[PDB]
Design a binder for these strands. Structure first.
Ligand code: MG
Ligand code: MG
Ligand code: MG
Ligand code: MG
Ligand code: MG
Ligand code: MG
Ligand code: MG
Ligand code: MG
Ligand code: MG
Ligand code: MG
Ligand code: MG
Ligand code: MG
Ligand code: MG
Ligand code: MG
Ligand code: MG
Ligand code: MG
Ligand code: MG
Ligand code: MG
Ligand code: MG
Ligand code: MG
Ligand code: MG
Ligand code: MG
Ligand code: MG
Ligand code: MG
Ligand code: MG
Ligand code: MG
Ligand code: MG
Ligand code: MG
Ligand code: MG
Ligand code: MG
Ligand code: MG
Ligand code: MG
Ligand code: MG
Ligand code: MG
Ligand code: MG
Ligand code: MG
Ligand code: MG
Ligand code: MG
Ligand code: MG
Ligand code: MG
Ligand code: MG
Ligand code: MG
Ligand code: MG
Ligand code: MG
Ligand code: MG
Ligand code: MG
Ligand code: MG
Ligand code: MG
Ligand code: MG
Ligand code: MG
Ligand code: MG
Ligand code: MG
Ligand code: MG
Ligand code: MG
Ligand code: MG
Ligand code: MG
Ligand code: MG
Ligand code: MG
Ligand code: MG
Ligand code: MG
Ligand code: MG
Ligand code: MG
Lengths: 134, 71, 95, 59
RNA sequence: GUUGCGUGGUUCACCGCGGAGGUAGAGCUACUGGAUGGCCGAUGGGUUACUGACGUCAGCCAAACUCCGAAUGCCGUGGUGUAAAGCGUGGCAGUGAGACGGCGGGGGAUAAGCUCCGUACGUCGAAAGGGAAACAGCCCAGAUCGCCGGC
RNA sequence: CCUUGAAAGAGUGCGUAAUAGCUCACUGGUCAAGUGAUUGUGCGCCGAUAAUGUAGCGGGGCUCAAGCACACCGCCGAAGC
RNA sequence: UGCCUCCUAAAAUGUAACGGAGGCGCCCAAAGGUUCCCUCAACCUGGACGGCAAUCAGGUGGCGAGUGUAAAUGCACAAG
RNA sequence: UCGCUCAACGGAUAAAAGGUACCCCGGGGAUAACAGGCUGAUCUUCCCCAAGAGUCCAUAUCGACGGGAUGGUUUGGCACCUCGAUGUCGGCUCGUCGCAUCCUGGGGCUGGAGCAGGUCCCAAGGGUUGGGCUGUUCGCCCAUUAAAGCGGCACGCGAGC
RNA sequence: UUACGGCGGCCACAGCGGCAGGGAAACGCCCGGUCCCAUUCCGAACCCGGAAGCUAAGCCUGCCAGCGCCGAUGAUACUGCCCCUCCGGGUGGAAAAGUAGGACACCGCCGAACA
């Protein structure tokens, strides 16, 4: 996942503070992954988790990814001193706050759905839990 | 990168209730962020000076923020 | 049907609401066509049980310290993390 | 009404407004006491410098 | 900073009153962009099982987005308080390598006892005494001298 | 996909290359006061892992606490007062 | 390496880095002064060449156009 | 009112480039090279999840995509001590310590018939060869061996060579 | 005092839209282009001279929440200063969004008719 355009190529780091206020409830499916701590979730990790969910359920069901990695992060070349201009973008990041719902899942069977979401959670650099649409 | 221009020190110089003399500069600005009211002239570079002694008074004049001076 | 005993809040604010929620109350407000809102503490666990048993469309027939007046639930402010009810909006109903 | 304000802690590390509120109230050293009226002007100073004093309503 | 001559509360603190804001937050069918899932489906694609315009219904994001919008801080003014505030004008300076800690940021890998800014913030510098085993910068507290007194 | 019926899978996992063979899904009777899942929290366990010498309470030692949480009563303690 | 505009910049002003983006070293004799008048872009329908888009007509449209030239603040009362 | 890319744009002259390993003097740990210190991107050693391979069988063995740490032996980042001097690689001599164990010692599992092995756990008492090439460390090769371990100590050790 | 034409205040709680109703004076459309004056062409507009027609439109009155607008209380986000290692807590402020709801404006002066 990569945005097609960005208005600003190099940006400040997104701020890691506060509880999430939007997208904190399951809205598209029956089961979801809710974040319990701040972190920078990468498109690599997102694709890893999506593939884990799909290969566990193997068929049927629908998976929603309601975050997008559009905030870029830069990096200087390897062996360089400090301060000769900002580096070029090299990561794409979603800014995740506690309470945010990361993935959503619909599937008939409780146990398989929960196992698939646990598969996904073990790929993310966050403590997360599984929640349901009541 | 690396260039910038000088800070131009714009903004409001006399706030509501202040007693001014004729010729006081009230607002340095670009464009009419504020508009001149009674006893207030604008100025060549949108400066909103005072035409008379009195107290500065801010208000609304159907969408425009205006500065006036009460005798 | 859904009986619930409530009281009128003494003080209203941020610290007051925190004290009530730690004492196990639900700070809530009851307005409607009566043109005047009451500030209340609903009991926490009892109201939660009433709500879970029959859903949000329940007609909360509640009594104030002296008077009785059945009410309805308008909306609930759910905290994201602890997933608990922080505040409840109630509207009066005339049968 | 009147109040009696006693300095309990020190002004080392105190901020400018707290130091000047203590000076305005008239407190010099630790355990010094002054007698002041109970009006809004006085309660503002006490609110600013509450963690450094002890206020009791005595005459 | 100090000192001479002027001025005299003008300084500063608190309360009240009169003012300008676009930060935190939030929101976006309020704009410029990003962007998830439905429905309608323009074209492009081979009768269209592929692409998915513009729309539309729900959920979202942004230092250089804003229909919004604090707490603080800032300007003025009226009261009250406060000796060693303030202002003008002269004599004589030193300084112009800062350090750490708290809070808000940039660079850095959101690394550094890193680096660069903000902060009527603190301490050290130029501060002895008590605590932290020892331990410039953390906590308590500012040594006029004496006492084989007390809290 | 259906059936005797007290109950009764072209099988629950090794296990047959296969037809075997072993257990187990679901009931009949005995004994008779209890038996599970999960949510949140207090304190704990493992993960644990460098080079002169114990060497991550300052030491002796401490769970018969001299540890931790909450409540309470004194006292010690500076060039502070 | 001077000047101009924005963000960093923490809602007065001011604020650093070999931090993030751009412009300038002109042009206009009208693109200045004054008086008077007008409202745009986009979309829909109809119409010879004419088509997504030239000119015309009628609707709808409160500013999404425009402003000599960057950006910001302004400007529809118009600074267009 | 005119005359300056005085553009290094507060404008040293109207008028101006280089080398020094032949170099000298005054200073600086205000500032680099070695070593120490902090950090740990890179490196190193592990681990979590389990897509798969392994005829069948994720977990005998190997484990992708991702995630979390340890260490401080690599290459770096910072410039905190040392510039009125802290001698710099390799070899020699003499060592000492760690264990992340190469051999010998003890075990579990095995896709362990036996002999041999693979993997993991425990274990630091002792041992851990001689040569060719290169200044070499490293490495390759030759002949052996139970084995020819990896690291720290100013990359131990020049008032010891 | 009532009810029509002007000039302002104010700038959506006033706007946009929908449905009905009106012509005494007035405001309007309306009839013409000799005269002042006018069209980047056009008496359409601007100007001038009139009074055959009509409330169809403008304008005015009443009723509609449809679109738009306003919008609390309470809670929350955030935050000044303290306590506190953080976690958190105390005390003082306090949103945006959403909800109940409001709303199809109000006021002043002059003239005419009525008084
Ligand atoms: Mg939001
Ligand atoms: Mg995880
Ligand atoms: Mg500027
Ligand atoms: Mg000019
Ligand atoms: Mg304000
Ligand atoms: Mg801004
Ligand atoms: Mg924000
Ligand atoms: Mg938007
Ligand atoms: Mg913003
Ligand atoms: Mg002087
Ligand atoms: Mg200097
Ligand atoms: Mg300096
Ligand atoms: Mg900081
Ligand atoms: Mg930083
Ligand atoms: Mg430093
Ligand atoms: Mg430095
Ligand atoms: Mg600081
Ligand atoms: Mg010094
Ligand atoms: Mg000291
Ligand atoms: Mg001092
Ligand atoms: Mg000390
Ligand atoms: Mg003293
Ligand atoms: Mg340990
Ligand atoms: Mg005592
Ligand atoms: Mg003393
Ligand atoms: Mg700024
Ligand atoms: Mg500013
Ligand atoms: Mg500020
Ligand atoms: Mg340039
Ligand atoms: Mg012009
Ligand atoms: Mg014009
Ligand atoms: Mg120069
Ligand atoms: Mg210069
Ligand atoms: Mg010269
Ligand atoms: Mg020399
Ligand atoms: Mg060395
Ligand atoms: Mg070094
Ligand atoms: Mg050294
Ligand atoms: Mg480390
Ligand atoms: Mg197997
Ligand atoms: Mg595993
Ligand atoms: Mg140094
Ligand atoms: Mg040296
Ligand atoms: Mg010496
Ligand atoms: Mg071992
Ligand atoms: Mg073995
Ligand atoms: Mg064999
Ligand atoms: Mg050994
Ligand atoms: Mg032995
Ligand atoms: Mg050795
Ligand atoms: Mg050496
Ligand atoms: Mg020698
Ligand atoms: Mg040597
Ligand atoms: Mg030596
Ligand atoms: Mg020596
Ligand atoms: Mg009539
Ligand atoms: Mg005509
Ligand atoms: Mg009409
Ligand atoms: Mg009509
Ligand atoms: Mg409110
Ligand atoms: Mg609101
Ligand atoms: Mg209305």
């Amino acid at each position: 996942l990569i945005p097609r355009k960005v208005k600003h190529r190099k940006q400040h780091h997104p701020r890691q503070r506060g509880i999430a206020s939007g997208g904190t409830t399951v809205n598209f499916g029956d089961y979801g992954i809710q974040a319990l701590e701040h972190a920078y979730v990468t498109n690599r990790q997102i694709e890893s988790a999506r593939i884990a969910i799909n290969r566990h359920i193997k068929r049927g069901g629908k998976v929603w990814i309601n975050i997008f990695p559009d905030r870029p992060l830069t990096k200087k070349p390897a062996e360089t001193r400090m301060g000769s201009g900002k580096g070029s973008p090299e990561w794409w990041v979603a800014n995740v706050k506690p309470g945010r719902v990361l993935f959503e899942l619909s599937y008939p069977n409780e146990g398989v759905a929960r196992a698939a979401l646990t598969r996904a959670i073990h790929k993310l650099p966050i403590k997360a839990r599984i929640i349901t649409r009541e | 990168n690396g260039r910038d221009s000088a800070a131009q020190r714009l903004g409001v110089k006399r706030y509501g209730g202040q007693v001014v003399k004729a010729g006081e500069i009230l607002v340095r600005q670009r464009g009419t962020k504020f508009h001149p009211g009674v006893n207030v002239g604008r100025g060549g570079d949108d400066t909103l000076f005072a035409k008379t002694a009195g107290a500065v008074e801010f208000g609304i004049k159907r969408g425009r923020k205006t500065v006036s001076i009460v005798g | 049907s859904n009986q619930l005993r409530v009281t009128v809040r003494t003080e209203t604010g941020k610290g007051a609401s925190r004290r009530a929620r730690r004492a196990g109350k639900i700070p809530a407000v009851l307005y409607g066509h009566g043109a005047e809102p009451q500030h209340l503490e609903l009991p926490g666990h009892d109201y939660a049980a009433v709500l879970r048993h029959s859903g949000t469309n329940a007609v909360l027939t509640l009594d104030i310290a002296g008077k009785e007046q059945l009410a309805l639930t308008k909306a609930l402010h759910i905290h994201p993390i602890r997933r608990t009810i922080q505040h409840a909006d109630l509207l009066v109903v005339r049968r | 009404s009147q109040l009696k304000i006693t300095q309990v802690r020190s002004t080392i590390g105190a901020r400018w407004k707290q130091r000047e509120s203590l000076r305005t109230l008239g407190l010099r050293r630790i355990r010094h006491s002054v007698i002041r009226e109970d009006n809004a002007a006085t309660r503002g100073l006490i609110a600013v410098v509450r963690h450094l004093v002890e206020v009791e309503p005595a005459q």
